[PDB]
């Protein structure tokens, strides 16, 4: 299995790639972010494992940063795998109320801090967490960095196919995808969970794949 990797994408914006074997899909590549505000670091999604999460936290602790927060974009393992470990290490975890509700019904450890607002400023003028509506899951969020104009689309951005449909809402995805396109047209870069960083066009490609998926449904 490939080692956790961390790459600077921009001043104050890092991508973290982690890997795990999932039945059927094989070795899954999961991209997350780390955002720096002054001396504070914020985790956008955790690696699959407490181990990789520990490795990620130590990387920024070693460089003089303090982890002031972590946001999970939805309730599946590839966003929440490290939450239990982060809690034990006194690092504040965030998730939407919907995400925390789904984690509870799944018997999984919940984030410590939750929020219900469609648009939540995790850090004023720096990290916005946005709920476009159901798609990949009922609770999937995206994260917007207005300074860099980077959108983290998580498992919601699916330009070449929708992937795991287990908890997907095919009827809502296209509406949610078009809502995303409406709000973040000004996006310079779109970082997704499982595909290469692209431009704003990746929001339109997701809409096309959602529409296609919905059609096969009927
Ligand atoms: C462990 C969980 O966290 C799980 C989850 O969150 O549900 C992980 N997330 C997802 C996900 O859908 O976001 C998957 S599957 C992932 C899709 N993205 C990669 C991929 O192979 N994409 C792809 C490419 C071309 C065609 C198609 C097609 O479906 O036809 C799919 C792999 C993971 C196992
Ligand atoms: Zn998922
Ligand atoms: Zn995923």
Author numbering: 4 to 221
Question: Paper's wording?
Answer:
IMP-13, a member of subgroup 2, sharing 92.3% amino acid sequence similarity with IMP-2 and 82.5% with IMP-1, was first identified in the Gram-negative pathogen Pseudomonas aeruginosa from clinical samples in Italy and is a common cause of carbapenem resistance, often involved in large outbreaks. Imipenemases represent one of the major groups of class B1 metallo-β-lactamases found in Gram-negative pathogens, and these enzymes can hydrolyze all bicyclic β-lactam antibiotics. The structural information and dynamics presented here reveal important information about the mechanism of antibiotic binding, as well as a significant role for the active-site-covering loop (L1), indicating that the plasticity of the active-site region is important for the broad substrate recognition spectrum of these enzymes.
In complex with each of the hydrolyzed carbapenems, this loop forms a tightly locked, tunnel-like structure around the hydrolyzed antibiotic, with several hydrophobic interactions appearing to stabilize this state. The pyrrolidine ring of meropenem, doripenem, and ertapenem is suitably located to form aromatic, π-alkyl interactions with His197 and is further stabilized by the hydrophobic environment created by Val25 and Val31. In the X-ray structures, the interaction of bound ertapenem and meropenem with the Trp28 side chain occurs via the sulfur adjacent to the β-lactam ring and, additionally, via the methyl group on the pyrroline ring. Compared to the apo structures, the zinc ions in carbapenem-bound IMP-13 are located slightly farther apart, with the distance for the different antibiotics ranging from 3.8 Å (doripenem complex) to 4.2 Å (ertapenem complex), whereas the distance is 3.5 Å for the apo state, presumably to maximize interactions with the ligand. However, notably lower values were recorded in the L1 loop in the apo state, with values of 0.51 and 0.46 for residues Asn26 and Gly29, respectively, whereas in the ertapenem-bound state, the values did not drop below 0.6 in this region. Most significantly, Trp28 NεHε had a hetNOE of 0.3 in the apo form, which rose to 0.77 in the ertapenem-bound state, comparable to the values for the backbone amides in structured regions of the protein, indicating a significant change in dynamic properties. This suggests that in the apo form the L1 loop is undergoing fast-timescale motions, while binding of antibiotic in the active site stabilizes the L1 loop.
